[PDB]
Amino acid sequence: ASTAPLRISFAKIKEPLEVPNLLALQTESFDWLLGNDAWKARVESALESGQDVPTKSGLEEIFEEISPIEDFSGSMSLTFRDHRFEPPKNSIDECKDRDFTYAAPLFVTAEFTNNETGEIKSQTVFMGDFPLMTNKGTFVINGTERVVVSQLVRSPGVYFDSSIDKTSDKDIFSAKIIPSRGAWLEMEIDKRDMVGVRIDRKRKQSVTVLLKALGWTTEQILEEFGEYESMRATLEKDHTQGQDDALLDIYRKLRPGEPPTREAAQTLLENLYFNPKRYDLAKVGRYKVNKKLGADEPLDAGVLTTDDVIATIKYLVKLHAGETETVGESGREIVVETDDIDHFGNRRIRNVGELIQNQVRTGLARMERVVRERMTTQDVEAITPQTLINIRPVVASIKEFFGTSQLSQFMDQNNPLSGLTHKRRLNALGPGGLSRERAGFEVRDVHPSHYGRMCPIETPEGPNIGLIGSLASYGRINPFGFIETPYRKVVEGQVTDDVDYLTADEEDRFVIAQANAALGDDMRFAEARVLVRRRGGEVDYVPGDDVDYMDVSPRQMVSVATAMIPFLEHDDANRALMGANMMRQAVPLIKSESPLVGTGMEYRSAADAGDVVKAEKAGVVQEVSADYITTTNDDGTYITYRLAKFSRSNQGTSVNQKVIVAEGDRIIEGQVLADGPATENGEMALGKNLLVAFMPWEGHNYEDAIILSQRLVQDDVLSSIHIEEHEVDARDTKLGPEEITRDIPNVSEEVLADLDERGIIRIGAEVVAGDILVGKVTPKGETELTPEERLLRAIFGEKAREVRDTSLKVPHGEIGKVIGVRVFDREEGDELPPGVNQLVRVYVAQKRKITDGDKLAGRHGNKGVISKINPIEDMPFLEDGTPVDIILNPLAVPSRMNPGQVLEIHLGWLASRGWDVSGLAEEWAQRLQVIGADKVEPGTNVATPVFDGAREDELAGLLQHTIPNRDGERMVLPSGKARLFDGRSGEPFPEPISVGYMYILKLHHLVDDKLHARSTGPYSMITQQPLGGKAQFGGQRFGEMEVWALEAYGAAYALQELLTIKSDDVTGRVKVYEAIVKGENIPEPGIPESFKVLIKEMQSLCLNVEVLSSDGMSIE
Amino acid sequence: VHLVGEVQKVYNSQGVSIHDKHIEIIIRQMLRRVTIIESGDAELLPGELVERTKFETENRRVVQEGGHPASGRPQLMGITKASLATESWLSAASFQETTRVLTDAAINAKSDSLIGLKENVIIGKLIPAGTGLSRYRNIRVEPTEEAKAAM
Amino acid sequence: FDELRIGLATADDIRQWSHGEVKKPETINYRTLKPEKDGLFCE
Amino acid sequence: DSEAVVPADAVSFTLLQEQLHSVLDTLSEREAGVVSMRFGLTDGQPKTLDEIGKVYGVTRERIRQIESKTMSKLRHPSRSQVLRDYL
Amino acid sequence: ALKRLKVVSAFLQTSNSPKGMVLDCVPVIPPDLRPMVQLDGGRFATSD
Amino acid sequence: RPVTGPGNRPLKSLSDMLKGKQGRFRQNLLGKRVDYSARSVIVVGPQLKLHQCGLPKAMALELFKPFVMKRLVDLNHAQNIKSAKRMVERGRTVVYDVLEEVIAEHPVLLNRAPTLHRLGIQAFEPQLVEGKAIQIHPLVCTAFNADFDGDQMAVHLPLSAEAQAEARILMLSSNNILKPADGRPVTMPTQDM
Amino acid sequence: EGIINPPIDELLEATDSKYSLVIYAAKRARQINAYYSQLGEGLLEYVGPLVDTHVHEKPLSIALREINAGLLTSEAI
Amino acid sequence: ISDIVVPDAKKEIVKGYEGQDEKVQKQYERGLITKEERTQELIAIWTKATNEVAEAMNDNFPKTNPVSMMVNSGARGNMMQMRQIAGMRGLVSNAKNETIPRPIKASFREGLSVLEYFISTHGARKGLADTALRTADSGYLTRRLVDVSQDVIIREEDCGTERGLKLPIATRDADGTLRKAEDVETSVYARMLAEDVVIDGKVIAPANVDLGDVLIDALVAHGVEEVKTRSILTCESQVGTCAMCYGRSLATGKLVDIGEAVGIIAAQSIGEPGTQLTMRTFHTGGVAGD
Ligand SMILES: [Mg+2]
Ligand SMILES: [Zn+2]
């Protein structure tokens, strides 16, 4: 009811299914891995509801996988029966502040049982701290919030590829069995008109030797395979016969250099494939292999069988010989056809649960090896479960899991929507998967199967285009790992209120309609003709009652960031991509305002993210305050939510939270009590809504650049807090300890003016570049005073002391008012790393205002740098004086093919000035009256879903019937354009101009970050050239193409100085500095040092690279 | 003519226009070498790439010596091969191959003359192109006598 | 700078370049943080 | 790295050398010389007062007295404004 | 034979003897070019 | 297999430093980093002349530190060189006035990262300007292929007399009207004018 | 009062080349900078700015002004 | 919103086409036509429809509107962009270079449908991936060209020889008239004639003179059908290549200076449009290698 603030909806179709829990992907996966109360509650709920679900948890499953270890005598056994958790010792807030990985204990009961002793000894053991995942799906590790992102991988199973070889002039077919863990195997038919097998592609071999190596005899082989001439030819050409002969031959081919051994060959073949450890096919692997090969109910869990191998032979040859339908071996009739890898039925997401499960599985494998080795080197009756298990591998792996992982990414908190988008991304890059260099055209490209399972619109535009994508809006994860999507049920042409979740394969069999298709007053189809999609991404129509499923919501194919955009349908896919990728960078502002026009889904995108602080009870607020808010339920429980205030995010932006509720207002569960960064009344707000007018203006908005008033600077409309944090450590070195002290040596008196007693800057002391933050002094250095220093000290009678100043200073080009300082002391109860006696961190916070260079942008991929901030007067104002807050080049919108923003501007103008529509008897008027958005007061937000947005007739009519803003006239003409009086020359612009309200964000490409410069600064060691980066005063790179351009100009002297004097010449740099300051002419450049490095290095490879002159030896 | 026309039509397929001299320079560079055939009197190997100037010099030398010239046939090879088979090993080394070229230069013991651009950019000296040429850089500057006479 | 002659570096040439001989894998004393004798980094 | 010679520090040191040498040149020849040897501006090893009293031909207490005299003279505010800022 | 002649003639014309194939003494890079630079925190930084 | 050492990665090798994109040859001898250089976002300022570019105050001040020091010493605003250093680091108004005095008649090479064709690097007259973003003339924008969505442009400083001579004669932004590809005008963009 | 203040075409026709002009102007600018940095030796070979000079100036501007006036001449060795 | 007016006629014409289309579908339901033939006739019919509606829109628009003013002037944009902003988008490349049977019938002003937006995206991402790759290859090509093209510097005032190169001054001469070459600029302009030319017994174009509009116009007027231009290919210089054979540079509009680096300039100019090319076969056509 009061879940969200009122937002007029322009939608035309009612939605049966609501958007699911938008964060379900992470929380449900990790609940399953933990197997805690929530997961099993969900499991029993599904079971009583009849829905399938894995009844066995993630942790207990991997434990049960490790059977009790058996020595060579098999006398003893260790059973890991039950696992359990305890509450974590450190609070989440404590962990974040004190740099502790949020974790809890994980105990397990180990039972030692020995037949020789005939006794059972049970004892509980503890394998180490387990990184837990908070309720907002972030692993707070080392005080930093990480998030683990899913991973797209080819599911294990059989894959058949059909290709054409130009040399052969004939089709070629290949097969590959891709396991979950084990080594790989391939099956290529008619490579040269014969079939062969790749056992890890070791060597050339036939199929006949393989089958003979198996117990299957030649007679039964030809009896089953007498109907395909390729295999009869292969059999007859194979001279070798007999199982023993084949086995020894294949062993010799696989492992040459030793005489063949029958028993060793058999055990090798069993180990490589049949062993349940080396070839543990995943549950998804068998689940798909049984469906593909058609075998009816094979073993649910296990390795491939000889039956499976022969079935694969038969399927492959049936595919080759051209028959399209064949009887499945020990199975029903099935289509035999090539299968494309790119289809999303073959792509599986490794949710975080499976990732951490694989890592802990590897750790337990190392633990198993360690305990087996210990068993082999331990005596009986001195063995207890407590002592034998070494917990080092599991902890070392789950800790190295977060490190060096392409999947454990630093969380981005630029805004709640960046958070959600980083949660939902399905990163194709990572270990055991599609890497950057392996990338091809096919993988990146969209596929028909992606619809509803992977948004094709949004993805990074960098070199990893398309590899990383955001899940669809309604996507849900199949327990095996494939991605589902809902569809409504249709029967006898009647759409029913039932929903079924279809995966990427079950979709193909049926025909799916479109949600946009109109429906009559009854539940039947209004029109016989209706667009549908079918197998292979076809789009052919099928009129009348033939469909069985239809999309439940038109926004299914679009992800959260893309669903935000209004009038999305009108924008080109490229500009929508840029608009959705941009919107993961808008920084929160001082006072966030919800967009005047925007998709109605922003409320869900706000509430679902974990930044907003909502209530878990339905009570009456009792004490509302800035720091905290107290709520009281009818039961009696009191809870005080503690709102964060100006605490640094990952990217260095404030996370200030407002309070919206009054004193005595009634609350309901899940309702939003406190607003978050970039939010308003619980609705998303990543920017403000400015008055935009499209016109070129003196060239200050040439090439897409932006012009905005000084009103935004003046009224604080676009301004963002920024909190930087930099810290120092008082570490103990060989010579002595470092002292954090106020008595800095060799300093003036006024520099240490605002320092506190122990050498800490006071709170609130505005700082600038060069100021002293925390005072620190070196213990001692071996000082050999130079003659000049000695003489000067003698004249002035100052004692140069061993203690030297190394105190932290504000980095150059930085301003701000300190807000909070933290100190951690060794001698105190606080724990620190070794060596560091004391640690100090200081928070410098500033209020950056929108300025020149600070990148600004809209929603539809229109972005620009500010070029000039005119005074409010110079802005071309409206007929009623309202100066337009921002100008924008119009030359953009036609060429860039994003005409959505013009519709957005018009609709925003409509939203700002309300409208009344009653009894107009117009088609658009009737549509609005039935929708209910007929009488709208000024200023109320208005919502246009991403694919059921306002129609252009509606906008035209509403513009005709806008509320008179003053004196009875509408400043905008029916065309959507208004009279603009130029503020500067004063004279009215010759023709009307388009004007309205557009939602503009402030991106994170602020000029203060980008601005860098260097006179002279640090240098590198191995090569003396200047080092890179901004933090270290790094010069810009004069790369190869720059010297190409300079050589093209013929300017050789400039190249010489840019390559020798200005870097890479140690003798030249001090010389040029001295020459400039003294005014003396620049000296002659020498030889660079990098060339000397090369000469020595090439002299270390035994090449006597001797520099020589025409007349004998050269002088250097 | 064929190469120039093909690449020019490929570019004009869009609408960009590159003056034919720019193509012509590269195409001259590709045809520079020649494949020696019937290497009887010239005494070097048959069937290896040899620069045109060296071929002409050797033919002139052998005909002056009285021996009949060894034959040669024009040969076109890609820009990559032409670059690799260059006199200045330093430029070749700074190219894609940085093992084979160093090794074979070491075996042959070829001293790299510093004529060229890239090899004079490694050393940090002045590139012999534009302001770095000898003729522009050797001048001396003095005013006229009447200038001193005035002031 | 007229020609960068390069060729095979014979054993005698390598001996000529050398100013000593490395005889240990020593790098730096774990306590003094100074180079050891006759090893890598030897002064 | 730390072994790099910061151009600003090197040039400041050279300017200090030149300014100091000029300041001593302001002083008398013998006084400037004796203070230079006492603080080794010419050579990296400064010489003790008696150590100066061999080449110059003065006694250790005599040279000491002029060393005190040099330190005083360079301590007047005249020849102190320039060297205060260089530290 | 063409390749073999190329290499053998290249060696015969050059004065340096072929025995340079087999190095008897391994030159060592100067230490600064492979720095074991001290790193803050009691740690170390070494080149391979 | 290579000598993996720690196991996370193959160990580097003598020749490995001498090869590839990261090799000494193609990374530290052809293209080096350079002192007296800067970088920043770029904006359009139409009121400039063709041969002028803006350098923000902090940017220009940190670029010309040696020259600002020399001028401050000569004009006696700072007693000696070290006091001049302290004065510029403080950033008093006299330093900005001296800066506006000294940048004049000293070319600076603006340069965009791709630098496809020799018109990527173009000399300009610097000019102090408020804000923190390089002002540039829209006429020369298309030569860089530079748009103003957001596009950081590096700024290099020619130091010696010869280099500034070339930057004034050869590389000036008004003696490069004609694109070298086909000799047609490139310095008359068309987006708005 | 600008970089383009001395036009270039007269210089080109005076020196007959473009790279020759920059090297020649650079030699002259080096000479005048070194003269301004004489600070007292008064070497006879050195010669000051022939054209009038501002209180603060860049030597290359003066050299280029001298070339434009044309009184300066060059002779290759 | 009132600036971009969809053509009123569009609906009618397209429904006619659609009517025609469904007839084909009907006569395909009975098996009288193969699926491939239906696909081919449909692709042809929709190509016709999109061309016709493009022409109809081109006629509809009045010359006074913003989009026309900023497209006709050459400021920015192109005709097809306005086609798919106002008229129907048309055939869109399916994944792995295929065409769909049911092209996009709505304009970006009218707003695409869900599946239509989805199919357009199939091509959009492909285009982005392709561009990222073509930039990479263009950079590689530019580096190779600059490497091979270096060491070619102009090191002689004038060539020793007179041999030139025969180029077509004028071609496609219609009956009873002389017509100059369509691409005369890129070939023969900025070249210097090896020898004079006499047509009426009098010299028309003197030797060692770069050619321009006046001279080329005069020579085509006199009726000469070919020309002999000195060029770098025929250079016979003992050191590098002379200035005379290279002809005038282009960035300056004057004779190339001695010592300029022509090689790097040529490489940079040839490599610059590598990113701008971005052309590929629209559809393989079901045949590989043709
Ligand atoms: Mg850009
Ligand atoms: Zn020539």
UniProtKB/Swiss-Prot annotation, chain A:
CC per GO annotation: DNA-directed RNA polymerase complex
Keyword Transferase: yes
Top enzyme class: transferase
Name of this protein: DNA-directed RNA polymerase subunit beta
Any one GO molecular function term: DNA binding
Pfam families with a match to the protein in the record: RNA_pol_Rpb2_1 (PF04563), RNA_pol_Rpb2_2 (PF04561), RNA_pol_Rpb2_3 (PF04565), RNA_pol_Rpb2_45 (PF10385), RNA_pol_Rpb2_6 (PF00562), RNA_pol_Rpb2_7 (PF04560)
Domain of life: Bacteria
Assigned EC number: 2.7.7.6
Function, as annotated: DNA-dependent RNA polymerase catalyzes the transcription of DNA into RNA using the four ribonucleoside triphosphates as substrates.
Catalysis: reaction(s): RNA(n) + a ribonucleoside 5'-triphosphate = RNA(n+1) + diphosphate
Gene3D superfamilies: 2.40.50.100, 2.40.50.150, 3.90.1100.10, DNA-directed RNA polymerase, beta subunit, external 1 domain, DNA-directed RNA polymerase, subunit 2, domain 6, RNA polymerase alpha subunit dimerisation domain, RNA polymerase Rpb2, domain 2
Assembly: The RNAP catalytic core consists of 2 alpha, 1 beta, 1 beta' and 1 omega subunit. When a sigma factor is associated with the core the holoenzyme is formed, which can initiate transcription. The RNAP complex including the principal sigma factor HrdB also interacts with RNA-binding protein RbpA.
InterPro entries (alphabetical): DNA-dir_RNA_pol_bsu_ext_1_sf, DNA-dir_RNA_pol_bsu_external_1, DNA-dir_RNA_pol_su2, DNA-dir_RNAP_su2_dom, DNA-dir_RNAP_su2_hyb_sf, RNA_pol_bsu_bac, RNA_pol_bsu_CS, RNA_pol_bsu_protrusion
Family: Belongs to the RNA polymerase beta chain family.
PROSITE patterns for this protein: RNA_POL_BETA (PS01166)
Source organism (scientific name): Streptomyces coelicolor (strain ATCC BAA-471 / A3(2) / M145)
Gene name of the encoded protein: rpoB
GO biological process: DNA-templated transcription
Keywords: DNA-directed RNA polymerase, Nucleotidyltransferase, Transcription, Transferase
Curated annotation (Swiss-Prot), chain G:
Reaction catalysed by this enzyme: RNA(n) + a ribonucleoside 5'-triphosphate = RNA(n+1) + diphosphate
EC numbers on record: 2.7.7.6
Family membership noted in the UniProt record: Belongs to the RNA polymerase subunit omega family.
Transmembrane segments: none
NCBIfam families: rpoZ
Protein name according to UniProt: DNA-directed RNA polymerase subunit omega
Enzyme class: transferase
Function: Promotes RNA polymerase assembly. Latches the N- and C-terminal regions of the beta' subunit thereby facilitating its interaction with the beta and alpha subunits.
A GO molecular-function annotation: bacterial-type RNA polymerase core enzyme binding
UniProt keyword terms in alphabetical order: DNA-directed RNA polymerase, Nucleotidyltransferase, Transcription, Transferase
SUPFAM superfamilies documented for this protein: RPB6/omega subunit-like
Gene3D superfamilies: 3.90.940.10
Taxonomy of the source species: Bacteria, Bacillati, Actinomycetota, Actinomycetes, Kitasatosporales
Any one of the GO BP annotations: DNA-templated transcription initiation
Swiss-Prot record, chain H:
Protein name, entry field: DNA-directed RNA polymerase subunit beta'
Record text on subunit structure and interactions: The RNAP catalytic core consists of 2 alpha, 1 beta, 1 beta' and 1 omega subunit. When a sigma factor is associated with the core the holoenzyme is formed, which can initiate transcription.
Protein family according to the UniProt entry: Belongs to the RNA polymerase beta' chain family.
Residues where Zn(2+) 2 binds: C159, C235, C242, C245
Function (record text): DNA-dependent RNA polymerase catalyzes the transcription of DNA into RNA using the four ribonucleoside triphosphates as substrates.
